[PDB]
Amino acid sequence: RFHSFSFYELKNVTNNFDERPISVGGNKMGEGGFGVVYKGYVNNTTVAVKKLATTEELKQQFDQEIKVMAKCQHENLVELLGFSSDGDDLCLVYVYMPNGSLLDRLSCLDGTPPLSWHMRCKIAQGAANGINFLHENHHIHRDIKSANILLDEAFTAKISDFGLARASTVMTSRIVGTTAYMAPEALRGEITPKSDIYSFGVVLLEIITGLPAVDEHREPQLLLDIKEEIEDEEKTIEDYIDKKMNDADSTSVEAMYSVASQCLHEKKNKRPDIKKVQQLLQEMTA
Numbered sequence: 672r673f674h675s676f677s678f679y680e681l682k683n684v685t686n687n688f689d690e691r692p693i694s695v696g697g698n699k700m701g702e703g704g705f706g707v708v709y710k711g712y713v714n715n716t717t718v719a720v721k722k723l724a725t726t727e728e729l730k731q732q733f734d735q736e737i738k739v740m741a742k743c744q745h746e747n748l749v750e751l752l753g754f755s756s757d758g759d760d761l762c763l764v765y766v767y768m769p770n771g772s773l774l775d776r777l778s779c780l781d782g783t784p785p786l787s788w789h790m791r792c793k794i795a796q797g798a799a800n801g802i803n804f805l806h807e808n809h810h811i812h813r814d815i816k817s818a819n820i821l822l823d824e825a826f827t828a829k830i831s832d833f834g835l836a837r838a839s840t841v842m843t844s845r846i847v848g849t850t851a852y853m854a855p856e857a858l859r860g861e862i863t864p865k866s867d868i869y870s871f872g873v874v875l876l877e878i879i880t881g882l883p884a885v886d887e888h889r890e891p892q893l894l895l896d897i898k899e900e901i902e903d904e905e906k907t908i909e910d911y912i913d914k915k916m917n918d919a920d921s922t923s924v925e926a927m928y929s930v931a932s933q934c935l936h937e938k939k940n941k942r943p944d945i946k947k948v949q950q951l952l953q954e955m956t957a
């Protein structure tokens with residue numbers, strides 16, 4: 672049900688893959704670990720075009736993205752419109768997300784207004800609903816992070832990047848992911864949906880605090896260490912709450928923090944499963 676583009680077609684609608692950032696006059700919107708994401712236009716639809724960038728491993732991920740996207744349709748997952756396998760360079764074409772990534776909105780990149788606490792609650796709920804869909808359908812995402820949660824015009828959260836996804840224990844020799852988000856067992860090469868939960872907990876800390884998961888010029892460098900600072904009585908969650916908010920109440924903030932803390936159990940089998948995380952976040956706003 673996806674459309675088969677040709678590489679030249681996606682080229683001409685992206686200003687010939689103009690790699691300059693959008694803010695500077697080009698078409699580059701961002702980049703990840705596996706390619707460059709370009710803004711484009713086909714017919715009357717604005718689209719995002721990921722031009723993928725070992726070469727054998729890249730092709731397998733490209734095929735996995737299509738396979739997963741074909742079987743996984745949900746309002747909290749990004750939508751694939753088509754692809755281009757013509758020639759050597761591979762492209763995936765997605766529905767455009769007018770509010771970009773959660774990572775960029777939490778940092779207010781390019782001058783966007785800070786996200787309200789009410790919007791942050793709806794985003795956390797939506798991202799949990801998307802992870803719940805993946806796990807119900809026996810997919811492990813393996814790369815949950817704020818850069819992989821995109822936002823549409825109503826700030827509905829949409830999980831992206833299923834190149835590394837796996838069916839759902841199991842150890843692997845190729846260890847992939849973003850270290851500042853990964854569970855300890857994922858860092859050791861275990862593949863388990865329990866690791867998706869841990870990474871989501873880090874995302875919840877980003878939502879609460881507005882801080883990046885890792886910052887070289889901050890103490891602590893790693894966000895997940897603040898749970899230890901709070902736990903050993905040195906600090907409180909209120910000391911870290913994003914100050915770029917005036918609609919956050921301590922009761923629901925602490926409720927979200929409680930979920931993140933539960934997700935961030937170092938021991939995998941003490942973590943809640945995604946259905947419980949889903950319920951806890953629903954109980955937050957009731």
Ligand SMILES: CC(C)Oc1nc2nc([C@]34CO[C@](C)(C3)C4)cn2cc1C(=O)Nc1cccn(C2CC2)c1=O
Nearest residue numbers: 700701708719721749765767768769770771772781831
């Ligand atoms: C996050 C980047 C890579 O992407 C974007 N960035 C965007 N920024 C803005 C603006 C507008 O005004 C600002 C001030 C700039 C915020 C909009 N915006 C849309 C996208 C976008 O649609 N990206 C994706 C769509 C589908 C899937 N994927 C994953 C699969 C690769 C995407 O990355």
